Design a protein around this ligand. Structure first.
Ligand code: 3SB
Lengths: 18, 337
């Protein structure tokens, strides 16, 4: 599931601006 | 009237824009309580104003890091704009000042915590819940854009919930007063409009695209474009293909196809009818805008408030000593702050 892919991705924490 | 309110609003803003308030407090009037959040060149702390007993949130920016990351001009933008604006859903700048090491902006303390925190914990918001917040963002962007301001940093990380459960928008770090178009490659990868990525010039429409990302993330629980690496995220934004969860209503998906629109001639917010293309969209049909503005509407979620100065709605961060150098750093660069 996409939710499972997200949760397992490295970008579920606070995201920094570039 | 809206035009009338906004015209009066503009006249108030302009007198403050041209004559910015400056140096209206000093560090020692505040008692420091706790770190509420951090950023690439600073942090934000809960503080208490000694003379009145009022609580506030103080943002502390390290001048040298601002310079190393080339954010001088962005930072001057942030304070100049923030002190001039006045709207129910904008975090109010109560005071600002600077010292040898840092710039300081003392805002109202919004005790409910970040939308980000509630969003990841709960998983996702119901649509009427997401709508109540989105409506407030819509009115806020109407106000902001009518002043010629572009916001450029919308994300759940930058939205706070107040005591009656209404939203307050914070972080004016990328905000800019610009009538024409601009080029700075800035923002958060997941929220960047394609025109930013492809190094075209761009405008206020990037905010409406970001609203689309926000509404999607609030309702889905994840953003429309994600991957382990930003380069791969851009490849996905640029290709523009978007997939929606099966639980998104039709009105929601339609609203989002229009906000998440790569074609600037078609992006909602950016057409002739301006923001009304959004206020009159079916997804907002049940929304009473005046009642929303007047805060006469019952919020979907009232945060637990266990008293004044309570912080249990924010994460714990490593506390660092607020060191102020004995030498002025970067004085010329921040003269007008
Ligand atoms: C938590 C809180 C409460 C409040 O009543 C008002 C606020 O403004 C905040 C927090 N705001 N946090 C940010 O703006 C963050 N993006 C940040 C940007 C640059 C440097 C450091 C952080």
């Amino acid at each position: 599931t996409t939710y499972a892919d997200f949760i397992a991705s490295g970008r579920t924490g606070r995201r920094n601006a570039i | 009237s809206v035009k009338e309110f906004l015209a009066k609003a503009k006249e108030d803003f302009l007198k403050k824009w041209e004559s910015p308030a400056q140096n209206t407090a000093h560090l020692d009037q505040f008692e420091r309580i706790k770190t509420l959040g951090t950023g690439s060149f600073g942090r934000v702390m809960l503080v208490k104003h000694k003379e009145t007993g009022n609580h506030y949130a103080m943002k502390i920016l390290d001048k040298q890091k601002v310079v190393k990351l080339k954010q001088i001009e962005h930072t001057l933008n942030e304070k100049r704009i923030l002190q001039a604006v006045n709207f129910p859903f904008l975090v109010k700048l109560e005071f600002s000042f600077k010292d040898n090491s840092n710039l300081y902006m003392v805002m109202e303390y919004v005790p409910g915590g970040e939308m980000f925190s509630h969003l990841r914990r709960i998983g996702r918001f119901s649509e009427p819940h997401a709508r109540f917040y989105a409506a407030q963002i819509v009115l806020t962007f109407e106000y902001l854009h009518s002043l010629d301001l572009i916001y450029r940093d919308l994300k759940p990380e930058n939205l706070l919930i107040d005591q009656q459960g209404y939203i307050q928008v914070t972080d004016f770090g990328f905000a800019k007063r610009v009538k024409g178009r601009t080029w700075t490659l800035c923002g958060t990868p997941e929220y960047l409009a394609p025109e930013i990525i492809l190094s075209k010039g761009y405008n206020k429409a990037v905010d409406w695209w970001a609203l689309g990302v926000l509404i999607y993330e609030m309702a889905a629980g994840y953003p429309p474009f994600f991957a382990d690496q930003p380069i791969q995220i851009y490849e996905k934004i640029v290709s523009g293909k978007v997939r929606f969860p099966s639980h998104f209503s039709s009105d929601l998906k339609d609203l989002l196809r229009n906000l998440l629109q790569v074609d600037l001639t078609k992006r909602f917010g950016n057409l002739k009818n301006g923001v009304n293309d959004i206020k009159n969209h079916k997804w907002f049909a049940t929304t009473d805008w005046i009642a929303i503005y007047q805060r006469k509407v019952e919020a979907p979620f009232i945060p637990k408030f266990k008293g004044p100065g309570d912080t249990s709605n924010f994460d714990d961060y490593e506390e660092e000593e607020i060191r102020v150098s004995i030498n002025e750093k970067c004085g010329k660069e921040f003269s007008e702050f």
